[PDB]
Amino acid sequence: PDKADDSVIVTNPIVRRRADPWVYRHTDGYYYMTASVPEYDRIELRRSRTLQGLSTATPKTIWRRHSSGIMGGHIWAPEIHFIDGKWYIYFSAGTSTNYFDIRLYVLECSDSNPLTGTWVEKGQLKTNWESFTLDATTFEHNGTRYLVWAQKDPKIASNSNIYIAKMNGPLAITGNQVMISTPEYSWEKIGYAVNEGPAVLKKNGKIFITFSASATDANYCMGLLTASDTANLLDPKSWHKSPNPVFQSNPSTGQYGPGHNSFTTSPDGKVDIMVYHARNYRDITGDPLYDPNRHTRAQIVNWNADGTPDFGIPVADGTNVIYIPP
Numbered sequence: 001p002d003k004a005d006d007s008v009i010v011t012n013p014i015v016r017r018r019a020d021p022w023v024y025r026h027t028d029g030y031y032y033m034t035a036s037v038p039e040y041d042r043i044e045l046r047r048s049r050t051l052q053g054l055s056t057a058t059p060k061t062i063w064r065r066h067s068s069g070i071m072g073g074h075i076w077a078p079e080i081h082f083i084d085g086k087w088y089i090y091f092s093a094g095t096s097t098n099y100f101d102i103r104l105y106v107l108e109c110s111d112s113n114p115l116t117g118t119w120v121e122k123g124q125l126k127t128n129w130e131s132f133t134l135d136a137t138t139f140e141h142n143g144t145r146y147l148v149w150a151q152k153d154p155k156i157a158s159n160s161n162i163y164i165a166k167m168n169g170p171l172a173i174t175g176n177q178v179m180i181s182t183p184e185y186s187w188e189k190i191g192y193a194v195n196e197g198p199a200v201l202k203k204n205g206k207i208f209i210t211f212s213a214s215a216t217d218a219n220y221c222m223g224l225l226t227a228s229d230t231a232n233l234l235d236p237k238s239w240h241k242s243p244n245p246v247f248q249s250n251p252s253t254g255q256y257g258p259g260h261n262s263f264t265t266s267p268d269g270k271v272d273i274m275v276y277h278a279r280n281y282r283d284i285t286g287d288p289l290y291d292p293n294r295h296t297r298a299q300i301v302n303w304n305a306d307g308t309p310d311f312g313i314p315v316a317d318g319t320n321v322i323y324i325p326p
């Protein structure tokens with residue numbers, strides 16, 4: 001039983017053993033959540049009227065990797081969107097012969113309930129060139145839809161960079177893709193040099209895009225890109241990268257390697273809430289890729305006096321009062 005509520009009060013972790021949390025608040029009174037499962041082998045979906053309710057909602061496996069061929073490798077970081085009356089899931093997948101040969105793919109469901117509904121594959125979402133491609137998100141602004149994602153440029157020594165492009169329908173991009181972020185500070189390079197997990201927040205006349213950098217261990221952290229929402233978002237000079245991490249490990253709250261966030265709101269739409277993953281310990285045994293204990297958690301997004309986002313530090317486990325309406 002998930003009863004609705006206008007206050008947002010959560011117990012972290014909200015969902016254990018789920019990395020890359022994506023939470024979308026729909027017009028039907030429900031939060032929808034997708035994420036990476038530790039086996040990297042399926043797409044699970046759950047819904048709840050409240051954020052905290054996600055801890056007890058029954059998850060459904062809606063899609064499983066192919067026995068062989070494309071979409072037969074790793075299954076990473078799906079995001080469920082609602083666009084033009086239809087559900088879409090953007091996710092990254094490798095092949096059976098190379099689990100790590102990752103491209104973008106899209107699913108679509110026309111039924112109103114996406115848990116019970118019928119899901120249909122729509123194939124790969126190609127970009128300007130074939131390479132390591134992952135973590136596509138989409139947003140709309142001033143009547144134009146965009147794709148923001150991470151991709152390997154063979155001419156650049158980084159696992160991936162952040163790209164933007166205009167879209168032509170929810171299933172394709174158009175034009176040239178534009179690089180708006182590449183690893184350049186040392187905090188983007190501990191372990192491996194990486195920018196990935198772009199996430200879009202629109203507020204205060206600006207478009208904010210957080211991203212994650214460094215390896216997926218305790219060194220994982222987040223940086224910020226900002227642009228004015230009246231600029232040319234395909235112009236790389238529209239995007240300013242904050243020089244320092246905007247979110248990182250905090251040993252005093254016991255939260256390590258936080259990142260790959262998404263953004264949602266309270267039910268009334270008035271506060272912004274960041275949903276992300278972190279571990280509650282520092283040292284990892286084996287390859288960090290198969291440590292399954294990145295846990296999904298949430299905390300409020302605060303706002304500086306000047307209107308830039310204040311992400312603060314990962315809150316300690318336990319209860320967290322995010323929002324009580326005045």
Ligand SMILES: OC[C@@H]1O[C@@H](O)[C@H](O)[C@H]1O
Binds near residue numbers: 076135
């Ligand atoms: O998103 C692609 C990679 O695999 C995921 O599980 C992680 O979030 C990231 O490093």
